Enzyme design. Structure first.
Site, PDB file in Angstrom:
ATOM      1  CD  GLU A   6      48.261  46.460  14.561  1.00  0.00           C
ATOM      2  OE1 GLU A   6      47.382  46.785  13.928  1.00  0.00           O
ATOM      3  OE2 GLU A   6      49.161  45.370  14.186  1.00  0.00           O
ATOM      4  CG  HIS A  38      52.654  46.361  12.166  1.00  0.00           C
ATOM      5  ND1 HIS A  38      53.530  45.289  12.634  1.00  0.00           N
ATOM      6  CD2 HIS A  38      52.532  46.185  10.868  1.00  0.00           C
ATOM      7  CE1 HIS A  38      54.138  44.665  11.494  1.00  0.00           C
ATOM      8  NE2 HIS A  38      53.355  45.222  10.410  1.00  0.00           N
ATOM      9  CG  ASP A  42      51.573  43.089  15.606  1.00  0.00           C
ATOM     10  OD1 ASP A  42      52.948  42.745  15.160  1.00  0.00           O
ATOM     11  OD2 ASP A  42      50.574  42.810  15.126  1.00  0.00           O
ATOM     12  CD  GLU A  73      47.247  40.555  14.084  1.00  0.00           C
ATOM     13  OE1 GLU A  73      48.569  41.060  14.218  1.00  0.00           O
ATOM     14  OE2 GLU A  73      46.142  41.396  13.753  1.00  0.00           O
TER      15      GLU A  73
HETATM   16 RB   LIG Z   1      48.816  43.364  14.153  1.00  0.00          RB
END
Ligand SMILES: [Rb+]
Ligand SMILES: [Rb+]
Lengths: 435, 435
Positions: free
Chosen positions: B292, B294, B324, B405
């Site tokens: 991911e 981020h 993300d 999220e």
């Molecule tokens: Rb995330």
């Protein structure tokens, strides 16, 4: 079982004993992170109660997945987890333990997250909460219970059946009171699986069913063009339906709340024949029918006299009085913001029934709902004068249940601490009255 | 299936169709009384949204115990109930229904309690709430999902698995993303009963498993005298363990969050061999491993380069990028209560990655977490420039999932409305780009 929003749980905050001696206290902690994690990633939890407890983060022991560890052990362990679905059980060594009451508890919890840089680690969670220790006071000669009514609004949003029973068991209470049309799923036809689970839950938490609340809704069909009143036969067919449900679920008492016709709550005229037609079944099932005396109805009142007159006329021993201790309220339920004087019924300020008025009725008082509204960090109840009520109830020879009916602000989770405070309050008072 | 605290639920607020034409809309209502009740004791519900609807209490239709009634039918029926465990489903006739968005719903619900004096009846409840209609907009070409990470803190306190899934299904999302060490009870050994119920639930709610969040906790035993570091074989055993769990539960992606060694969040050195040692099993299971991106890691960074470099040196089709959308944040998260200007982490003000930078990575982007923090009642997202993010994603050819999220304030229940606004905003934006 659901966890409380506060990281420090109220449920489980209790002294811990081994072979009779108190070795310390425990409390429970919901994991703050978004995941459960390996137990070795814990970096401890400092604990403080000012003036009684002050320990660094490596001192408390951790019960996780059924075993207890020191922090040094957690650090070297493999395979052990703090699962998200379990509160961590923190034990603090303290010989003799903690005194009864509410305690301001402060924790410093430390967790290692490997995906966070070391310049911001460990993750530290600081919180404080006033929490009520499970009562050490005996509370004799009363019996201690909780009505699920105490958890209204909580129940079904943050609370399920198993969570509430676990909360009741932890208080040392033995009795659970419920409201049939509230807490029996698919009322009046609970599934065989639900009922099996019900008795399993009672067995697990050591609870016995006490009162099941029920209604006689006289205004069932009061609205619309084809409106009608509720017949005697319909009143008793419903009361009989709730006596059998009660028996099936193991309750000893049923409180039918009857529709009223006047301000001080005089029941509908069908109430007498509805009860009379139902007493053979209540005797057959060994269930007692106990209508509730609640504010603004005092003990000295024509509806109590008629209840007692029924007992004399029928000869029955399966009809009794249920008292709601809000009749003893001697201080006003607070005004909300925006309201002003005179905008609410008089009795919400208290009808100050003299506790001694129970002496002349006590022989027929089979169950007591311990209604209350607010108890603070010092165990000071803000409306119900508990010492005189209890004094009178004791001297009068009452030895039955006191069943918590919290009815304060329904702020989420508030009722859990409140019920705990009431049980700590009442049992301590009962013990000092014994001296 | 817990209910939300507000009497007006967000889940179930949706337009209602019959044979393709919208006949009206519905919402769900939690019974406010302390009990379920016979349905004839309902005296109706008035409904209003300013400028769209204003109907009197005898107009809405009621679905209860599987059947839909008018008020006048409820008054005349016997045996029908509003059970405490079921939200009432209220239907408001309105041809064409409501537009997408948040609506300020005001209800006037009336109930007849027979035990209360006539001069204080019917019992009345007036509440107003901003609730987001289930999306009418297509949202193509993207696919829509929700990660249970959005419900952090609510999960396990006010929410269980089935309640979560119901809320995702109602949004019209099809994908459910979970965190393995969060939402798999008894991780890593879920019971056969839990796994069977998991697959029952997904079928019931029409959802498909997308991403399982996973971790490689390099600091597993970083504390204590016997401290050590995570070896490759242990790291790869932990990854292979989550790969199997994810396959057994039917996910197609696994996001390993690898412990970092620096502020640009460079993964631990073992990450490369852990992944390379795990690619065959992910290939054998047909599960994609996607780390991911981020914040504060931008798209333009060695971390991303090395990821794409791995895909190419290995040839694998089972390694990808998870993006993300917080890396695209162009406005600051507000200062938490009591914080200090500057003391916070730097990137929490947003790192403003150019949305066009996805064109260079898009061929290896397999999954997108739609991180957001705060969307108000006019569908204004306060942090994430969705229109250029979404336009870049569409022009770059992305047809995969956008998995909610929510990471705003963890006020109880707030995540529910927040996620619904997220799917409504994005599906609506997406539809405009189709023009
Ligand atoms: Rb995330
Ligand atoms: Rb009561």
């Amino acid at each position: 079982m659901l966890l409380e929003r506060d990281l420090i749980q109220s449920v489980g905050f209790r002294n811990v004993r081994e072979g009779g001696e108190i070795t310390g206290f425990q409390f429970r902690v919901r994991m703050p992170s978004y995941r459960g994690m390996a137990a070795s990633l814990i970096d401890g939890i400092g604990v403080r109660i000012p003036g009684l407890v002050d320990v660094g983060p490596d001192v408390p022991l951790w019960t996780l997945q059924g075993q207890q560890y020191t922090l040094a052990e957690l650090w070297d362990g493999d395979g052990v987890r703090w699962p998200l679905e379990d509160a961590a059980i923190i034990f603090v060594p303290l010989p003799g333990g903690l005194p009864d009451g509410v305690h301001e508890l402060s924790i410093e919890l430390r967790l290692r997250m490997s995906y966070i840089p070391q310049e911001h680690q460990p993750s530290t969670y600081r919180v404080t909460k006033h929490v009520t220790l499970a009562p050490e006071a005996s509370g004799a000669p009363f019996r201690y219970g909780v009505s699920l009514y105490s958890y209204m609004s909580d129940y079904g949003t943050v609370m399920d059946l198993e969570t509430a029973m676990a909360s009741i068991a932890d208080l040392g209470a033995t009795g659970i009171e419920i409201l049939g049309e509230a807490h029996v799923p698919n009322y009046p036809n609970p599934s065989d699986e639900w009922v099996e689970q019900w008795f399993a839950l009672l067995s697990t938490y050591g609870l016995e069913p006490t009162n099941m609340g029920s209604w006689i809704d006289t205004r069932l069909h009061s609205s619309g063009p084809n409106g009608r009143d509720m017949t005697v036969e319909e009143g008793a067919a419903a009361l009989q339906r709730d006596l059998r449900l009660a028996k099936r679920l193991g309750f000893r008492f049923v409180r039918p709340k009857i529709g009223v016709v006047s301000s001080d709550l005089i029941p509908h005229p069908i109430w007498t024949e509805v009860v009379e037609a139902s007493l053979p079944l209540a005797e057959e099932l060994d269930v007692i029918i106990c209508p509730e005396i609640h504010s603004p109805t005092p003990i000295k009142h024509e509806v109590v006299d008629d209840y007692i007159a029924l007992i004399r006329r029928t000869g029955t021993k399966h009809f009794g009085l249920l008292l709601d201790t809000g009749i003893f309220q001697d201080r006003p339920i607070p005004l909300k913001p925006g309201e002003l004087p005179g905008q609410r019924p008089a009795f919400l300020d208290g009808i100050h029934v003299d506790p001694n008025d129970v002496f002349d009725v006590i022989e027929n008082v089979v169950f007591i709902q311990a209604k209350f509204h607010d108890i603070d960090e010092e165990l000071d109840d803000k409306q119900i004068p508990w010492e005189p009520v209890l004094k009178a109830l004791k001297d009068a020879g009452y030895t039955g249940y006191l069943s918590s009916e919290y009815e304060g602000e329904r702020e989420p989770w508030r009722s859990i601490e409140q019920v705990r405070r009431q049980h700590s309050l009442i049992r301590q008072i009962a013990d000092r009255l014994a001296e």
